Design a protein around this ligand. Structure first.
Ligand SMILES: *[C@@H]1O[C@H](CO)[C@@H](O[C@@H]2O[C@H](CO)[C@@H](O[C@@H]3O[C@H](CO[C@H]4O[C@H](CO)[C@@H](O)[C@H](O)[C@@H]4O)[C@@H](O)[C@H](O[C@H]4O[C@H](CO)[C@@H](O)[C@H](O)[C@@H]4O)[C@@H]3O)[C@H](O)[C@H]2NC(C)=O)[C@H](O)[C@H]1NC(C)=O
Ligand SMILES: *[C@@H]1O[C@H](CO)[C@@H](O[C@@H]2O[C@H](CO)[C@@H](O[C@@H]3O[C@H](CO[C@H]4O[C@H](CO)[C@@H](O)[C@H](O)[C@@H]4O)[C@@H](O)[C@H](O[C@H]4O[C@H](CO)[C@@H](O)[C@H](O)[C@@H]4O)[C@@H]3O)[C@H](O)[C@H]2NC(C)=O)[C@H](O)[C@H]1NC(C)=O
Ligand SMILES: *[C@@H]1O[C@H](CO)[C@@H](O[C@@H]2O[C@H](CO)[C@@H](O)[C@H](O)[C@H]2NC(C)=O)[C@H](O)[C@H]1NC(C)=O
Ligand SMILES: *[C@@H]1O[C@H](CO)[C@@H](O[C@@H]2O[C@H](CO)[C@@H](O)[C@H](O)[C@H]2NC(C)=O)[C@H](O)[C@H]1NC(C)=O
Ligand SMILES: *[C@@H]1O[C@H](CO)[C@@H](O)[C@H](O)[C@H]1NC(C)=O
Ligand SMILES: *[C@@H]1O[C@H](CO)[C@@H](O)[C@H](O)[C@H]1NC(C)=O
Ligand SMILES: OC[C@H]1NC[C@H](O)[C@@H](O)[C@H]1O
Ligand SMILES: OC[C@H]1NC[C@H](O)[C@@H](O)[C@H]1O
Lengths: 387, 400
């Protein structure tokens, strides 16, 4: 979407994966979807390095809406958002952050809150701009394919007409199977800054693998369509939560990075471990995710040993390599060379291991190397030519 | 198997899951299958609390064998076990530990090492006894159903005839689909101390779930067959390795415990984290696993919320409850009561949370309680009548 926004993938925090539709503030005031939750997460983003490392969006998901007023104007739940959305936008902006919100192109949101029907698209866009929202995720429950086909472009046009830059995250393709012929990716790129292609992530490794598999199976279609201002979105990061081991957490971060994915966390920043913080705040990892060329990577090799290799092209003739072990036994000593991974010519390279920081220098195409990859884990290199 | 052994489930360490068939000692001397590996793990078991908490077996798995000598007697790989197996058993015994070994009922071991064919069953049994081995896992690759039907009983007979008590772990049912009519658990209980019923565990939560699912699906058949001296074996613990998160690690320990499973670790004890050690050395958990009644637990409740409840009966009218969340979203507040979990009227209970150590007092059948369970995680209770604390302190004794 040619609105000047998200020339690199968005980074931030989104409520949904970890906090879901918890509206029981009487019994669970610390974890319910409320003004307080968003304010506390904003404070953590401002104080604990997140904003400074690039995590700038703080996004509200489903279950925020209270009703519509006598003029049809959307309102938040008055008990859980007592000061209203402008207050929250203004608070988040005071901290150098951006505020995302959520609506559904349909009769109801997925959890049954008031929907943004076709006759409300313009009014709701105007309301969000007036509130000084910076991003909108538009979900697709409770609509027909024909409604979505009218509604997603209508919303893009309506947001534009407000005059406020609002990053536009579109769930449209996920409701239509994610693939041609039903999904037109050239159209999506013109109307959306990013789109959810596929199934909701859940807090499990099986879920990450399911998503990674679908993205790799369809990479010939998906890889070319991503670039500055228009991203594929394989859904939120699980790092900090319950289902992923340490190796798996590191793998998700590396693979999302090689895929030029959004880095949208969804975890309790108030209690996040040092180890998980260190994964998410890895400066080189973030540099790679945010590479200005915005070229999505692809799986380039899959071996009978169950080691997979991903490669992402980067600026200044650099590359990212992810060596990923699908094995479920023990560490594996993977032997390769840059020549076997389709680096050609007479270039000499240097690599930095993204997680260890160690430097491997003087790699020619014919130079044999070994990387030790743990099960359900990765080794990631930032590779560049040297003199 | 009525050989006096494993009146409670075996606890120890087995090389296979974590170290597999790594024989490259030239390139990987710290992690290859070798005497050094076993000696180092033995030291860790003796020094780091493992033995003292009940973990007594140190078990060799596949890929130890060098060949058979001119008389047909098994030899370990001379490059990787230079001092021989008797030396290793002596060493292990000197530390108050027991040595387990591995063979295959068939032409070759699964990894292609010399097999214990029907003609070698007796010689191999005698060799193991002579080496002062304490446990044998007998795998089932490269055999036919008839060879296994003859061989597993033949080995049990051969072990018995040596006069040395050797705990006998039988893979027979895993190679027969784990269920009647092909598997005869009455015979297995008479010839084996434990048996692998099902698929090899791998270092993944999916794997743990697949095994749990199978054991629960078939629990009406499997639960009654377990008891002192004859256990179901859902395979090794993954705690300490790569694939399980903290919640999943705590879950596997709890669920293996309620299933009266062996607690056979397979992890690098030299680098294991304090967090993982704390799971595996939890004293109340181990007490429950080792309960003298040896009654395997069951899944008693499954809810549309994807919360499952398992219960294991224990000594002194106590029970273990494991509340298990199959959810993949966020912590869940599970509301229940003992009456809804089929506890029978009038008894007042107390519970100790096995992981937090917290005590919950005044539980009657009707009293509503809430437990907070994390995704792919558990809450486990040790539950006892609050008349058994008093009665355990009013036992009168006399000399004789
Ligand atoms: C509502 O919708 C309109 C229409 O889509 C948006 O207006 C567009 O805004 C974008 C982003 O600001 C504009 O794109 C930028 O144009 C710059 C100048 O281009 C001139 O020359 C071209 C022909 O060569 C003309 O078409 C155009 O009218 C201009 O006169 C470029 O310099 C910018 O370059 C960017 O990309 C390159 C690499 O791709 C980078 O190197 C640069 O750093 C930079 O990021 C960019 O292309 C676009 O021109 C606007 N179109 C129109 C018709 O005005 C509104 O932004 C939008 N409003 C809201 C509130 O959402
Ligand atoms: C080869 O196979 C034979 C079986 O065919 C095995 O023999 C069995 O060995 C076990 C273990 O040693 C014996 O079990 C023990 O019997 C002890 C004595 O009981 C006898 O006497 C009573 C009289 O009241 C009879 O009723 C009974 O049938 C026995 O004949 C018990 O004292 C032992 O109790 C143990 O457990 C209790 C808890 O349950 C503890 O409190 C005790 O401390 C103690 O540890 C035990 O039951 C069994 O009797 C033998 N069976 C037969 C048929 O002889 C061999 O062991 C086996 N050899 C090898 C090398 O594997
Ligand atoms: C969304 O809402 C519209 C308007 O309420 C729904 O259309 C009505 O549906 C009811 C219940 O089936 C019918 O009895 C009415 O006759 C309909 N009225 C009108 C004016 O259309 C529609 O079914 C809903 N759409 C989706 C996708 O769920
Ligand atoms: C184990 O080894 C024996 C001995 O080689 C195998 O027996 C042969 O099997 C083939 C085909 O199955 C027959 O054609 C021969 O008649 C057998 N040879 C002898 C000398 O008996 C046996 O099949 C092997 N068993 C397994 C399960 O692999
Ligand atoms: C790399 O290793 C292979 C063995 O797989 C060897 O044959 C080859 O000569 C080596 N290449 C170089 C450039 O050293
Ligand atoms: C337990 O909770 C139920 C509803 O969930 C309630 O009806 C009942 O009265 C409660 N029982 C007790 C003993 O408080
Ligand atoms: O109900 C909210 C839920 N709907 C489905 C979306 O894909 C999720 O990310 C989340 O927004
Ligand atoms: O090859 C060894 C391997 N064979 C199959 C067994 O089930 C595993 O536990 C292991 O012993």
């Amino acid at each position: 979407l040619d609105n000047g926004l998200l020339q690199t993938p968005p980074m931030g925090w989104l409520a949904w994966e970890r906090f879901r539709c918890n509206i029981n503030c009487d019994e669970d005031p610390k974890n319910c979807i409320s003004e307080q939750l968003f304010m506390e997460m904003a404070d953590r983003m401002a104080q604990d390095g997140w904003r400074d490392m690039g995590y700038t969006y703080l996004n509200i998901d489903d279950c925020w809406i209270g009703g519509r007023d006598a003029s049809g104007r959307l309102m938040p739940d008055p008990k859980r958002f007592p000061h209203g959305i402008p207050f929250l936008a203004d608070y988040v902006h005071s901290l150098g952050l951006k505020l995302g919100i959520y609506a559904d192109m349909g009769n109801f949101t997925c959890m049954g809150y008031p929907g943004t029907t076709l006759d409300k698209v313009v009014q709701d866009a105007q309301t969000f701009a007036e509130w000084k929202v910076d991003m909108l995720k538009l979900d697709g429950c409770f609509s027909t394919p024909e409604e979505r086909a009218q509604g997603y472009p209508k919303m893009a046009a309506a947001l534009n007409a407000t005059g406020r830059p609002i990053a536009f995250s579109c769930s449209w393709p996920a409701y239509e199977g994610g693939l041609p012929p039903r999904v037109q990716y050239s159209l999506l790129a013109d109307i959306c800054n990013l789109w959810r292609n596929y199934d909701d992530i859940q807090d499990s490794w099986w879920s990450v693998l399911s998503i990674l598999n679908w993205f790799v199976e369809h990479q010939d279609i998906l890889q070319p369509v991503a670039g500055p201002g228009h991203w594929n979105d394989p859904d939120m990061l699980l790092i900090g939560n319950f289902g992923l081991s340490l190796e798996q957490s590191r793998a998700q971060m590396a693979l999302w990075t090689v895929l030029a994915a959004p880095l949208l966390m969804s975890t309790d920043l108030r209690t996040i471990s040092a180890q998980n913080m260190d994964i998410l705040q890895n400066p080189l990892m973030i540099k790679i995710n945010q590479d200005p060329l915005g070229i999505q990577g692809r799986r380039i090799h899959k071996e009978k040993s169950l080691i997979e290799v991903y490669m992402r092209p980067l600026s200044n003739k650099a590359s990212a390599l992810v060596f990923f072990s699908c094995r479920t036994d023990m560490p594996y000593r993977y032997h390769s060379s840059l020549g076997q991974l389709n680096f050609t010519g007479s270039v000499i390279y240097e690599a930095q291991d993204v997680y260890s920081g160690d430097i491997i220098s003087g790699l020619r195409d014919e130079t044999n190397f070994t990387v030790i990859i743990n099960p359900s884990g990765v080794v990631m290199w930032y590779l560049y030519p040297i003199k």
